[PDB]
Subunit: 239 residues, 4 copies
């Protein structure tokens, strides 16, 4: 069984990739950062797993298709895609520009359209169904202040997860999403700095928290679940 994870060079994506390896997947480590992607892939291969690094800008449709097919050929199948890559824009709502919007929507939303399309083609090529797993956010469930552009892209991903699930279900292809809360990654190590210029369980999130949920969404135990965006936020928003 084969999975491709975008943004897997670090943070949540990396934790997801390592957990899927533990679960028995061969994993394509897809990232625009080929240095971290190759480092993660090498770590997996050293430890006896099976991984390959693929460089891709997920806002580029051709590169997304190329990444999926490369994964499929090299790893010998294709069963799961995790559309995880994304960026945060910490800019006041009134200061958001058209260029900002074009960038963040291409990276956070169009990428998921492209990933869905490429994955479905690979599933068909392999002659079976599959699982599409999308990174949303708590900001996809309740809009977050000063992260206005970001929030709206994650709402769009939530919507995409629903509509794609409806359309692809007859093919035996499911589409679900995960909604992290506040996770101490590089993303929040930039949100932190830009913000300067609630959790029921009473602790911030670690990438492994999300990885555990994605393990379920990649497993047969989630076969009959589709179109859902699941919160693993330590109890911030209830849905």
């Amino acid at each position: 069984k084969v999975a491709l994870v975008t943004g897997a060079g670090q943070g949540i994506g990396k934790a997801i990739a390592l957990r899927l390896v533990k679960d028995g997947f061969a994993v394509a480590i897809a990232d625009y950062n080929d240095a971290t992607a190759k480092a993660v892939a090498s770590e997996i291969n050293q430890a006896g797993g099976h991984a390959v690094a693929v460089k891709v800008d997920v806002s580029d449709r051709d590169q997304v298709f190329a990444a999926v097919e490369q994964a499929r050929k090299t790893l010998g199948g294709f069963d799961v895609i995790v559309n995880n890559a994304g960026i945060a824009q910490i800019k006041p709502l009134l200061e958001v520009t058209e260029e900002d919007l074009k960038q963040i929507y291409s990276v956070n939303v169009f990428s998921v359209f492209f990933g869905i399309q490429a994955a479905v083609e690979a599933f068909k090529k392999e002659g079976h169904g599959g699982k599409i797993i999308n990174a949303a956010s708590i900001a996809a469930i309740q809009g977050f202040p000063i992260l206005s552009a970001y929030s709206t892209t994650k709402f769009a991903v939530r919507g995409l997860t629903q509509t794609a699930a409806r359309d692809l279900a007859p093919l035996g292809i499911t589409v679900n999403g995960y909604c992290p809360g506040i996770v101490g990654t590089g993303m929040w190590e930039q949100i932190d700095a830009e913000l300067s210029k609630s959790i029921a369980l009473g602790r911030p999130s670690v990438p492994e928290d999300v990885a555990g949920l994605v393990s379920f969404l990649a497993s047969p135990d989630s076969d009959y679940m589709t179109g859902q965006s699941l919160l693993i936020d330590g109890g911030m928003v209830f849905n």
Copy 2:
């Protein structure tokens, strides 16, 4: 007299909204990319005793949106309400959606609302008071629709924007709410039904009926249904409501 600007007011839901707001006592800027229909609606209002001005604007263009709001503020002598209503539909199987499709529909359906919010906030500040921002979402913003994936995702984005902007702008005394129509017999559903017909081979009208079979109240919607809700959202009775996307869909989805 308070002042409202309604985008996409040349026809359909926007036109109905504009006419109802006139009835409620607003002076209204009729904003549309279609100059002829905008002028026609404005003329129809002025000849029936109301006060309206036509403003040609492509809402996907930020500079034009600011220009439209400023023109409304100057000509009508105030600015109290903006209705971000203009939008388009795309009808295409998910796997066939192109990057160009996405760039177009997000520009028109989503970026436009960012620009409308920004322009209105600046106008409210120049007028020295708060205000109301009202966004056209959709039932497709609550549950994603089959064969209209691009459209559905833009409306989800508008729903999210309504929430986020409501949080951010509340300290300024500015509220942000949305309306979610169901299946409304406008030019847009004429288009949707026709394009669905080409895809699945069902005769003209049949797709409209099947998408409408889910409606509890047992009839499709008319633009006036939506105008009534927007009247509330433009009135002082909605002053303490913000961040909400309200369904007036005859009972298709419950939220």
Copy 3:
């Protein structure tokens, strides 16, 4: 003149709703278990030119609810709107909630709405037309509140009832919607704040303030805020809306 019955109309939100519906032109039945306040509010309406009757009813009693609606229908000469507003709050840590607590609050807050719906539907049929059913939910029906578990669960139940009844009754031309107030300074929050104070030791008023810190618009709610929404829900402008629970909470939760 159309006819509305409002339960819990002796004081607080119910009283404000009743007075606003009178302003809108309804004849109103003032329904309350408190006979004195019901009579007082009815008298206050009649002495100011409106038309009202006081009806003593325990809404947890099905026979009394039917009797109250029938009395309203006969005395006021019609029946068009019912507002199921009467309710109580309990304030108690989750692990300390008793079976007797549950039996009481579900009887008053939930079963009452079943009975109101049933009584109103029968009345609408006797009058030979459709109608509007309007239920008091809560922000606690959308997100469960700490230390008010019993109350929160009853309001979730009312939210569900609003949806289910909307589906079932739509063919009869009867709509069912709900309103979700936020933090409203009534006798109920006087009680809640006092009981929370006894639990966590914070001075009177401080719990009310902390529960209100989440409000985007930066002020607690007054009953008039809710009355404005219910005015819309009682008006023809909401005819095509059904099954919805609408938040007017100053921006605490977004739905």
Copy 4:
């Protein structure tokens, strides 16, 4: 590790119980039907697992507490409770009586209050946190026609899951729920008969579908998730 599952004599509850056994739990089979409960418990024990049958009417607070403590003593711990027992009332909205409401609320809602309270006491006794897992329904997310009383009880359970999660999180106790769709069990083999007098994946649900989700909710992989009601309905409602 020890789990108690109510309504485990048959249907979804039984499937949940058997899956938790496979996962390594000792399981208390709790039911008002002691015959089926004892049969399921015996099946588990015969196969090398560890189970005990407990008779309980979950609408009876004292019996719920007694069942939990019996499980705790006999099986040697207490880590998970699954509040699964419930009934359906297929009665027209206008025909619903006060007696109907008293019955269905005591069985479907009060039971979950009681189960939560009893489980928390056992968790404290054992000196650790735990997992509370509640059976909601698709009818808890969108109200279902002609199942009006039922729908409202499941909405209440959804609300209870949220509020209890908020209150119990500081104790390291989580509360989540599962929302089955249309499952071919004895319950729908009564709803079927009373109804007489949409699924994206294009097939009805089997009890094992739900069991897979509950396995996740009983596992460490769900530790950071709380207050959520998760749909596994084959794509009927999206949340």
